[PDB]
């Protein structure tokens, strides 16, 4: 005796974390599937068009299958007043049958968005799929490192800005290495450096560049700043690279990362379907919601789960930079 209420999940769309705002994981490179196994094709080849004749026809991608981790947050009790989920029809919406549903959906979306932000930051920073048990111990049968998955390796770096010299030389060399790795595409938009607030301050005021960054600060001139105005982050552009001060808190100090934006199919995502006998071999809606009124004779629960995974197919283009303060 379970009734589905997944459609109401759209009544309050999630927010957009800093990575989503930067466009690293957007709604474009994210597809909904109908199986627990998700296909990701890392197409690194040429699809160039060329001139042909009026007749004569004329016109090999490594893809991998993984298991999408399951994460239910079904912990929820219906208060028998929040049983106003019998919406639409004729309803009594006003505020009584609208605001309660909106608040419940907003709470669920906040929890799901926190989980998804954790997944995305794990994919970008640790270069692996997030999958952990209740105790906080990684499930090695689901946490698959991308480098060891695609048969590829990632770049590194080592900079200490306290002593002397301009650190941006290493960043430029990494830029040349990355663009050589892209080769026949070279389709990056900008070079961003996700750095902590302390690292940003340390690298922004050292005497080699302490004048240009402070005296000649081009406020509201950077493309990211103009495209932002929804977050209070601080940016600085120099030597063809941009320093971005992440303020989410998940960026551990002493570890800044530099990577390009705009490379197609570099970052992907998926929304596997929910575990059920009715939702098997059926397309997924992303975040689910079921109202169970037969699990317990005393209270009815609101079961909610989300299946989601991320990877960096072109993981070779990420510079796992290390800073020292």
């Amino acid at each position: 005796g379970v009734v589905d209420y997944t459609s109401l999940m759209a009544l309050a769309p999630r927010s957009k974390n800093f990575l989503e705002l930067l466009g690293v994981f957007s709604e474009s490179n994210t597809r909904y599937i109908d199986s627990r196994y998700a296909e990701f094709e890392r197409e690194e080849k040429g699809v160039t068009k060329m001139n042909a004749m009026a007749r004569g026809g004329s016109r090999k991608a490594r893809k991998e299958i993984i298991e999408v981790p399951f994460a239910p947050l079904d912990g929820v009790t219906v208060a028998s007043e929040v049983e106003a989920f019998r919406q639409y029809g004729t309803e009594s919406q006003t505020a009584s049958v609208e605001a309660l549903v909106q608040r419940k959906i907003e709470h669920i979306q906040r929890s799901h968005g926190i989980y998804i932000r954790d997944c995305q930051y794990t994919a970008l920073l640790k270069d692996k799929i997030l999958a952990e048990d209740e105790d906080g111990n990684e499930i090695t049968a689901l946490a698959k490192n991308f480098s060891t998955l695609w048969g590829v390796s990632r770049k590194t770096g080592a900079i200490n800005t306290t002593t002397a010299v301009n650190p941006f030389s290493v960043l430029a060399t990494k830029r040349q290495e990355i663009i050589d790795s892209m080769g026949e595409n070279n389709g990056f938009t900008s070079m961003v450096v996700l750095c902590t607030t302390r690292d940003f301050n340390a690298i922004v005021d050292h005497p080699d560049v302490r004048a240009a960054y402070e005296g000649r600060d081009g406020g509201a001139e950077y493309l990211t700043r103009r495209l932002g105005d929804a977050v209070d982050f601080q940016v600085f552009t120099h030597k063809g690279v941009t320093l971005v001060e992440d303020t989410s808190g998940k960026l551990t100090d002493g570890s800044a990362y530099m990577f390009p934006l705009g490379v197609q199919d570099m970052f992907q995502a998926v929304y596997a379907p929910a575990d059920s006998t009715d939702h098997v071999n059926t397309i997924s809606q992303g975040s689910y919601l079921f109202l169970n009124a037969g699990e317990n004779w005393r209270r009815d629960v609101i079961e909610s789960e989300v299946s989601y995974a991320c990877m960096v197919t072109r993981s070779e283009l990420i510079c796992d930079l290390t800073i020292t303060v």
Copy 2:
């Protein structure tokens, strides 16, 4: 012989005071209830999701009940020309049956907004619920200090910017204390310092920071300034904290407060229902309005009341800073 006209309250929505613009008390963390007693749950725990299996289930909040203070401003006399509250139907709206109603509603909303701003500023500054009699004497049976309510304590500070040194060190230490208090969440957006105009000027031009704040003033670069453009306040960002010059007038001189923005469920609010035999155990519309035409044989009155309360559940994260000029 009383007819209700609460629905017309929406014809002129209230303004948004500085606290509402900053997002401290917004329409999100504010719910309408159907009883004089309001429930507030200070959930400070972990609701993290984790990986599970295809089967096996897998998935303690202190809440307190208070009395919502009642505040009627029913003082109002119908002029027998402002008896045009027989709107809609066919009406004669034009200006005669529209502008009078709009002006009356705007006046009532202005009074209610002043009262609500007083409530919110009392909750933030004095860390207690505002409840006073006609003489201006606190009703101790309703004014419940939040610290002594949740079994929690608040932080303090002591800075004199007239002599020397950079005051922001104390602010940074308080920031670390607050983020340690949040612990496993650390989900603050920015560190704002509600300071008076005199305190702002004193702390902005002392010679330790007199150059950066004046010469290197990043006008229209702060997130608050970009998100504002509806108030003429002045802001300054330094050392990872923002100085905000409140211009509402309710911020007494010599007492600036520093607190974080964005912490979920830290600030809440409620709208208890109106005292009546028809509005008991019925959801509330916020601000009410009744037209009484039998109270006095001579004149008819316009009774209006609003029930409203605020608290700071995570009161431990507020730094009750003290400044000296």
Copy 3:
């Protein structure tokens, strides 16, 4: 044989002079009445709400009546081609029956707006109602000084910026005097100084403040500048007061005025009805328009009139400052 065409007055709304843009006289504090006598209530008291009980009830304004000056500009002749005022119906609008009406209405609105701007500037500057005969001689039976009307007095000042010292000290003292006059309200938004271009230049570049105003000019940072972008005025903020360079031309040189913005009911206005046997004891539409086709056998006229008045109820808060160059 007269047909009314007052409704077409809305086809081209008036502009907004500098005072209207600043919000001194807006559409909020302006009401339409149905008599030649207008009521203005200077409520300077407390309407504060307070806590009460579930039962027990719980909950003197000087208002004055004046005569609204009448001002007809009925001088107008119908060209017998501008007799296309038989609009709507089926019409022939295209451009023939639309642009002629629009141009006539725009001309009438321009004249009325000039008159109304004169009324508003007289109310603010000379602190009296504008009422003059054809020769330009004041009608003392209608020109009622606000100070001698409300039983109140206004403030003054005296500053010469040519010699030395910072003039803003006098402005600050006047600010304290005004806020003391408001007392239990203190609800001003900003301190604006309506000053002429010559006075603005004289007070902006004297050596005491010649550096901050020029070198440290916070362009596009003032609230008025951000809220403007529809006028080319120049502003400067210092010592908690703003210097505004009026460019309307009605501000005589050597006389700058400082007054607060946002004080409720300080500035009011009214639109008395037109003088007629059909428009007596009838609500007013503001600006009227009648087509008279029986006044003269040769030509038909377009009679237009507007009744309008302004006052400063809280006149005690205006600083009639005097400058010397």
Copy 4:
């Protein structure tokens, strides 16, 4: 056998040249007439309203008639595929019956806009109506100088910025002369100086003002710049006058003009009707278009013409300034 297609002219409205963007010749002071002779009334008098009584009534413009020059650009051949001007009905619009019509209309509008910009620049600069034959020789029977038309004279000037001193003194004196000429109106908005790029550079960097214009350049602070953002011109404000660098190309070097903006009825325009037996004593649509399919047995032509004229009624307020580099 001619069918009219004037209505399709609105499918692609013209652009707005620099003069139109500045508001010198806008859609407000431009009326459509029904005769080859156009009436322009230079009303320089007082229409001020004044107080009157409840009864007693209470309440000479030089206008000139000119011939509107005719300018046909009927040179056009229908390709028998651009015979898709049988639009609407049921059509086949898609792209075939839409884009061809749009391109033809855009071409015609571009030619007409070039002609109209020439007319407007001739009216402003040479202070005469543009009317020339095919050879480029002025038709003295239509080119009527405005000064010799209204019985008025225009101002002049003489400045050489290469040597020394501040040129703006002459501009200020001309400003006082102009405002004295306006007298009882004085309703100008700003003092603009249409100057060439070379003249702008010469007058902007001479050592008397080389510091303020370069070091203290108030970028995006001028009213014109904020109201622009559709043209890449450069502006500078000083001494109550604005220097505007025209980039249209029709401003000959060594001749900059200073004139006020906002003066009512100073600049006017007209759209006389097309020369035909069906369009005589009929209101005009501005730019016409006729499809003639009987003029030539071989090809059908697309006849298009526009009648248009401009004048400066208050020509006495224009300073025909002369610069020397």
Copy 5:
């Protein structure tokens, strides 16, 4: 047994590369035709209007025909789940029948946009039509140089900014040469210099102009920057010319180009129809899409092709500048 699905191409419009954003190749100067041969008319003459009489009538363009290169990217296999191209009707859209189609269309549009950007950059930089075989060898029977096509020649330049002097003198001389080439039109908007990032940095910080470009950087003041805010490029204006730092990657280092914007008919484009027996002598939709379900008994393919060409009719106005670092 082939069904056409060209209409769905509009479900996801292409992006706009840097050249399209600058307006070099926009949707205005781009027409859809119905033959493999495209007509381009380089009209460099006078179409000026002039005054005429009420009667008397009053009122030679080199055009060339080329073959539009054909470029199919028909390489595509239907997954038998992406056979949801039976959209509309009643459908099951939700996400299943919407997102798959949207993703396929977005992929096809991305490939086509890359091809079209290559065509446009070849037309602008190499001044020839792009046409190459699979091996990447130019088809000389389709690659027609514009100079040798129109009987015209292009300009050149030679600047080395490393040594001394101001390079902008050569740019100014080229500007005068170009405007002399335009002659009786002179209708350019701005002088842009498409330069690489390295060339931009080299030419922006050399000591002759190292101060104005850095100290006096007019951020957000250039017209291109205001009209942009969709790309993170950097611009600088000096001596009446603008330096633009292209970041697309197709601009080879050591070769910057200066050319004017706004010249009518200088840049054109075309969309020839698809090669088929049903799409011959039929207007073109730009990018096509056909679903072939009889080509192979095993899998069905998604055939897609685009015919497209560009030229610079007024090629004489482009300065093929050469830089040296």
